[PDB]
Design a protein around this ligand. Sequence first.
Ligand SMILES: [Mg+2]
Ligand SMILES: [Mg+2]
Ligand SMILES: [Mg+2]
Ligand SMILES: [Mg+2]
Ligand SMILES: [Mg+2]
Ligand SMILES: [Mg+2]
Ligand SMILES: [Mg+2]
Ligand SMILES: [Mg+2]
Ligand SMILES: [Mg+2]
Ligand SMILES: [Mg+2]
Ligand SMILES: [Mg+2]
Ligand SMILES: [Mg+2]
Ligand SMILES: [Mg+2]
Ligand SMILES: [Mg+2]
Ligand SMILES: [Mg+2]
Ligand SMILES: [Mg+2]
Ligand SMILES: [Mg+2]
Ligand SMILES: [Mg+2]
Ligand SMILES: [Mg+2]
Ligand SMILES: [Mg+2]
Ligand SMILES: [Mg+2]
Ligand SMILES: [Mg+2]
Ligand SMILES: [Mg+2]
Ligand SMILES: [Mg+2]
Ligand SMILES: [Mg+2]
Ligand SMILES: [Mg+2]
Ligand SMILES: [Mg+2]
Ligand SMILES: [Mg+2]
Ligand SMILES: [Mg+2]
Ligand SMILES: [Mg+2]
Lengths: 181, 81, 25, 118, 66
Amino acid sequence: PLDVALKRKYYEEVRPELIRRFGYQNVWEVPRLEKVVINQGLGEAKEDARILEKAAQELALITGQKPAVTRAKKSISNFKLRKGMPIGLRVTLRRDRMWIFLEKLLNVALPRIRDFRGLNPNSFDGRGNYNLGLREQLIFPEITYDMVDALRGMDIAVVTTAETDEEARALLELLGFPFRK
Amino acid sequence: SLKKGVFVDDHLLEKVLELNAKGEKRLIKTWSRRSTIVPEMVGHTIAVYNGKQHVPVYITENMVGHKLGEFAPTRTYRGHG
Amino acid sequence: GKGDRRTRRGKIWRGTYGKYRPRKK
Amino acid sequence: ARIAGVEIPRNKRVDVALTYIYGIGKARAKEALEKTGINPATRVKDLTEAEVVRLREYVENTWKLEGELRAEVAANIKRLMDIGCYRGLRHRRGLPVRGQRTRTNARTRKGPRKTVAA
Amino acid sequence: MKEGIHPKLVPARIICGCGNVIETYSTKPEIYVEVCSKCHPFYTGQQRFVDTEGRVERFQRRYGDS
RNA sequence: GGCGACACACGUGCUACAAUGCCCACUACAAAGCGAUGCCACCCGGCAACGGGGAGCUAAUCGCAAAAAGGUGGGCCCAGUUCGGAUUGGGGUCUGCAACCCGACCCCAUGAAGCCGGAAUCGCUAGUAAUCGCGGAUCAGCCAUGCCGCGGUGAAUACG
RNA sequence: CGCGGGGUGGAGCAGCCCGGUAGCUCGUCGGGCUCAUAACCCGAAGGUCGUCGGUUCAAAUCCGGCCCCCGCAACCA
RNA sequence: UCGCCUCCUAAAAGGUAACGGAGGCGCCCAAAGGUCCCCUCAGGCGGGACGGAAAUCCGCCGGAGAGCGCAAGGGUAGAAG
Ligand SMILES: [Mg+2]
Ligand SMILES: [Mg+2]
Ligand SMILES: [Mg+2]
Ligand SMILES: [Mg+2]
Ligand SMILES: [Mg+2]
Ligand SMILES: [Mg+2]
Ligand SMILES: [Mg+2]
Ligand SMILES: [Mg+2]
Ligand SMILES: [Mg+2]
Ligand SMILES: [Mg+2]
Ligand SMILES: [Mg+2]
Ligand SMILES: [Mg+2]
Ligand SMILES: [Mg+2]
Ligand SMILES: [Mg+2]
Ligand SMILES: [Mg+2]
Ligand SMILES: [Mg+2]
Ligand SMILES: [Mg+2]
Ligand SMILES: [Mg+2]
Ligand SMILES: [Mg+2]
Ligand SMILES: [Mg+2]
Ligand SMILES: [Mg+2]
Ligand SMILES: [Mg+2]
Ligand SMILES: [Mg+2]
Ligand SMILES: [Mg+2]
Ligand SMILES: [Mg+2]
Ligand SMILES: [Mg+2]
Ligand SMILES: [Mg+2]
Ligand SMILES: [Mg+2]
Ligand SMILES: [Mg+2]
Ligand SMILES: [Mg+2]
């Protein structure tokens, strides 16, 4: 679907606010938002390669994409880890499917997080992308809670064309990202 | 606890109410650890007694409902080894 | 059991009275 | 279904299944049951999403609970320590706060025993 | 997207302490969300319900009347 | 102020680990002792501790008093749980010149170890052992689970 | 100098060979039995593997240097 | 100690001794082979639940210091990885 409420909210009322604030000679110079990369690192399923495809089934359900699997770069002794094995799932979502996911994340998921006095605002990476991570997977609407065998969280990479943190913050703020200020 | 109550020994309650309207305030040593503290105690430095000597205790506003002896410990420990 | 002061058994054992063993007859 | 925080109770009884929340039990349970006017002998398994929303919305709103409660008891203790007070030292050193006796069994608050020689 | 191997992702409706989020466009249409914060209970749309800090406040208050 | 200390070690005990059990309601049956510087019916306020009031008793003459287990009914459905209530947070009550060190009690929250205990080891031969409650001395109050007593129910087993 | 073996809880000895895991007796500590000690029983603690380097994902283990130990040898002159 | 490979000695062709200085081989791989197509390292800094010097993820910087089954050399990402 090409409609998707947040996409809109970005175009009508997020873009202009940004042009009003920083002020921009070019339509392109104003920050767009590409690539939410979701990544589950799991040493948890290492010797068990079965547990994994459940986690990928879970990730599919909330993303609408099947993740691909990442495999161990080098071999490390101290926690098991032959250089062969699967460490975790990683899904790239952009372009619509991205949007429909961030919407759900803003209006349902984070709200459901126990505590949550808001998203940490130091996680901006200095060139203006943002990262965060979640402890449990059941904070999502598509997860039924009786389909959790074991908790696994993840890492989320919000990538943005904004050259700086400040602008990147502004973009995401205006989209409705709740921040701990 | 008490309530119809809030007991404070008149010894220091004197010299404290005194150190409010004098305009000057300094170091005051009481044996009264049974008393309660504040509001006009705050900012003052009182030396409470543990049975052995008088220990200076700086008075701030979350020390409020507490007796003075709470900030002047009677025993000496530092563990066994 | 006799040590739960929040019950009839506790209160009796401790000899006391309250919401969990109110005095009536 | 789930009340404050996540805390899903289930099956069992309802007025019992309410204990399983941090901050609530016995009394506070039997209370919110007639102040939302719900049968306590009913089982959380089955009941109207109606009596479910009345129930969540009451509890979550009346008193503070798992997240903010824990953090509030947390903060009290922090205050007791670092103010320098005597209840504070016994939190600092992991020892019993209210009278009692440490020459012998404090175990609950001292840990397992750590034996030494004679 | 490679055809096979995939959740449908069809338009939905969805629920909360609030009304519906028409947005949806998710797998598995008709979902029920326990509560959100936005929809403005519980933090955003700051309610500050149940509110804390009372414990420095209290010790000074019932205190000096007695 | 300390005798109340706490890395630890021992003795005597209380409470348990549950369904011959826990909870709530209703409903029975004791004895011995204490009390007009005290015991306090009954009414009211309070969820309650308790606080107002306030009659009777120098006491087989009024009070402590409810005995508890039991009985009946209902609930819990084998779960670290309606088991178990240690710890801790907050809120109060009473005594007392005063409850920080060091009080007892009520309420809200918190709910720990514990699923019958290694080697070892104690008591008990009948109205006993188990188990259930009650009074008193000391005493302002109380760390009593102690002690000295009172009755309720009430086994097993001794070839030798 | 030369060739061969060794260095691991307090003591004595395995494990090294064949990379991943450090065990055995005794001592030590806490309980028990005894009037008491020993014997005896029930529990526990304790080693970074001489050392410095290297190899590997990983070194007590494989490799090199150095330091001690024990043994053998040092003949025709 | 004795055959074989790498480096130095070796005096800028080749070659060149010593009981000169240092290391390796006596295998291995049905994919670690042929071809076509694609992809590009290590490291550092910043961000990210369990994740720690390091598992996985995201950003920038990083002409090769990585990789090329094993020693060393030469070579090599305009690929041999
Ligand atoms: Mg930053
Ligand atoms: Mg950017
Ligand atoms: Mg109980
Ligand atoms: Mg004594
Ligand atoms: Mg003490
Ligand atoms: Mg006892
Ligand atoms: Mg356990
Ligand atoms: Mg005290
Ligand atoms: Mg059981
Ligand atoms: Mg026993
Ligand atoms: Mg007494
Ligand atoms: Mg008694
Ligand atoms: Mg011994
Ligand atoms: Mg002996
Ligand atoms: Mg060596
Ligand atoms: Mg190494
Ligand atoms: Mg000869
Ligand atoms: Mg000769
Ligand atoms: Mg000569
Ligand atoms: Mg060269
Ligand atoms: Mg040459
Ligand atoms: Mg030449
Ligand atoms: Mg030449
Ligand atoms: Mg050789
Ligand atoms: Mg890198
Ligand atoms: Mg980093
Ligand atoms: Mg190279
Ligand atoms: Mg080479
Ligand atoms: Mg090489
Ligand atoms: Mg080379």
